[PDB]
């Protein structure tokens, strides 16, 4: 007589079932002896809210604007806008070598970085 | 012989290695690259793994021999949970002391006159017993882990009301959660006592000596009784990872350095978890010896000789209904040999404060046979408790 086609949630089951099931919220600590919960400050996501005083942009855009075509950003486009200008100046000067690619901005490895790209270790 | 642990409950033998590993110059093809198990590929051999950082929740201690405080010679530790097999007879040999039945005359003479007795003393003790076992909590019959400590704190509080007659009781306090350490040798046996739990009555003045000089010198003719084949270190925690260190429990500068009395409580609901009357007195003697030995070493250094001013430490051990009294005097700190000066210990055994307590009336055939209250109350037992508390202040 049980409903097998309804979502199984923490509101169903005995006491042991109800307390063990959650709602999707991430854990921010661990349980120690004596059923005492220790909250870790670093596990709590801290919001980086910027100062919005004197900010020009607003939630909406005025209709009196041109209908510019959409140009998705690509890796080739970003390389030309950022890294290519520096290489051209160094290429003309004649001081260019693959050993110095780290100076242009290339990262041989992601280890030792606060924000690794793959696998990423930062939230949205 | 018969081994303990059936082979089914033990960890099963790991499966035999695949025969690809037995062929030299041949690299096996395993599922280590797939990061999951498959049956049609060889089982990889994983090298041992280290976490790489210290995690308190998942810490593993180094092997025992790698511990810094590791000694080949074992040290036998006596604590609150040790239950000696021979009781007092085993405790007397470890502490090198002579047993004397009955409390000293000087201690008992303090409460011999009616002038030092408490006003309405008999009624006050009955109300302390009645409150502890009947009126203490909401439940009709409180457990022993509840009235055993309370019945002792109230008696101390009852004896602490005599400051009006004796202004010398204002120089003492009751310390809880106090510990001490004491290390010595008994025939090439390194022994250590780590007392904890109970109440430690501290005083600003040391207790006066009980036995005279001639009585102490008469202990050389006494010989310690043996209990072969049972070893003196039986039922002791034989530990190879220890630290020989003397500790009075307090740092230098404590206003109440001299211990007066140790109160020991067997507050356990289960009878097997409670020390026997013979074993409880054994715990008292070792703790009284351990507390007195730390004072002797702190004041007279870490030598081994006959003390010029012997230290007297009292102890009262109770089960909540049965009381044991001990007066231990430390006469020497050279315990390696069995000859010479030996310590003295006055012990009173099996002192009943009350024979039985009825928390409910006994109604048989609609007749109240036994009313609520203590049965067989002995006021003489509390006099001994009062005499020990009044020692050093009268």
């Amino acid at each position: 007589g049980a409903d097998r086609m309804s979502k199984w949630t923490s509101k169903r089951g005995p006491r042991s079932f109800r307390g063990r099931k959650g709602r999707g919220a991430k854990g921010i600590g661990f349980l120690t002896s004596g059923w005492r919960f220790v909250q870790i400050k670093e596990m709590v996501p801290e919001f980086v809210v910027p100062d919005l005083t004197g900010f020009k942009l607003k939630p909406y855009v005025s209709y009196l604007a041109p209908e510019s075509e959409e140009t998705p950003l690509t890796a080739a486009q970003l390389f030309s806008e950022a890294v290519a200008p520096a290489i051209e100046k160094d290429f003309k000067d004649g001081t260019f070598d693959p050993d110095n690619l780290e100076k242009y901005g290339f990262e041989p490895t992601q280890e030792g970085k606060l924000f690794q790209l793959y696998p990423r270790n930062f939230l949205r | 012989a018969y081994e303990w642990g059936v082979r089914s409950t033990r960890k099963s033998e790991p499966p035999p290695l695949d025969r690809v590993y037995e062929i030299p110059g041949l690299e096996p093809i395993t599922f280590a690259g797939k990061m999951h198990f498959v049956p049609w590929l060889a089982r990889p051999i994983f090298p041992p793994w280290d976490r790489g950082y210290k995690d308190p929740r998942f810490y593993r201690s180094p092997p025992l021999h790698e511990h810094p405080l590791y000694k080949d010679q074992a040290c036998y530790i006596f604590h609150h949970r040790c239950r000696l097999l021979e009781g007092v007879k085993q405790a007397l040999w470890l502490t090198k002391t002579k047993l004397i039945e009955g409390l000293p005359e000087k201690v008992l003479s303090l409460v011999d006159d009616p002038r030092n007795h408490i006003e309405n003393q008999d009624e006050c003790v009955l109300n302390v017993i009645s409150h502890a076992r009947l009126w203490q909590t909401t439940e009709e019959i409180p457990k022993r882990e509840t009235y055993c400590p309370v019945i002792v704190d109230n008696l101390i509080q009852l004896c602490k009301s005599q400051i009006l007659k004796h202004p010398s009781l204002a120089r003492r306090i009751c310390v809880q959660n106090s510990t001490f350490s004491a290390t010595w040798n008994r025939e090439s046996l390194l022994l250590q006592v780590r007392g904890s739990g109970g109440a430690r009555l501290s005083t600003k003045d040391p207790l006066p000596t009980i036995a005279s000089r001639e009585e102490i010198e008469a202990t050389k003719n006494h010989v310690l009784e043996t209990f072969y084949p049972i070893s003196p270190i039986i039922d002791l925690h034989e530990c190879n990872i220890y630290d020989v260190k003397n500790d009075t429990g307090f740092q230098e500068g404590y206003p109440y350095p001299y211990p007066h009395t140790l109160y020991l409580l067997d507050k356990a609901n289960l009878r097997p978890h409670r020390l026997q009357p013979d074993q409880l007195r054994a715990k008292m003697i070792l703790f009284a010896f351990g507390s007195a030995l730390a004072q002797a070493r702190l004041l007279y250094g870490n030598d081994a000789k006959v003390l010029e001013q012997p230290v007297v430490v009292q102890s009262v051990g109770t089960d909540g209904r049965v009381f044991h009294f001990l007066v231990f005097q430390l006469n020497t700190t050279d315990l390696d040999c069995n000859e010479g000066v030996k310590n003295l210990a006055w012990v009173d055994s099996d002192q009943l404060l009350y024979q039985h307590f009825w928390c409910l009336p006994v109604i048989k055939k609609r007749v109240v046979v036994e009313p609520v209250g203590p049965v067989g109350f002995k006021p003489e037992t509390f006099r001994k408790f009062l005499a020990l508390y009044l020692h050093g202040a009268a």
């Binding site: 999707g24 939230l123 | 995690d55």
Partner: protein, 101 residues
Amino acid sequence: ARNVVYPLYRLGGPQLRVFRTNFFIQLVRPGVAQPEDTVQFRIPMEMTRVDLRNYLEGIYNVPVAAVRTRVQHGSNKRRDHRNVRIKKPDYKVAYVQLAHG
């Protein structure tokens, strides 16, 4: 944030920081009489009271003293023309008390 993978934390690790959050709360009028300082919000299930405490202080600069949350069950009794149960989504109700009176 919700529907994202939180980077794992170990002892000595960096502070977990979120720069863009997808949590959207909505202030609602309580259906029952409430204390004056009490404020009621509807928050996503993934949101905790610790996150909501920093959410209001960090974004709206609202000092908060106590946050209490509960999960509200959505009725599954409604059925359509096919006799198939229609589920009202469950939402979490948060009760926020102002700090300085």
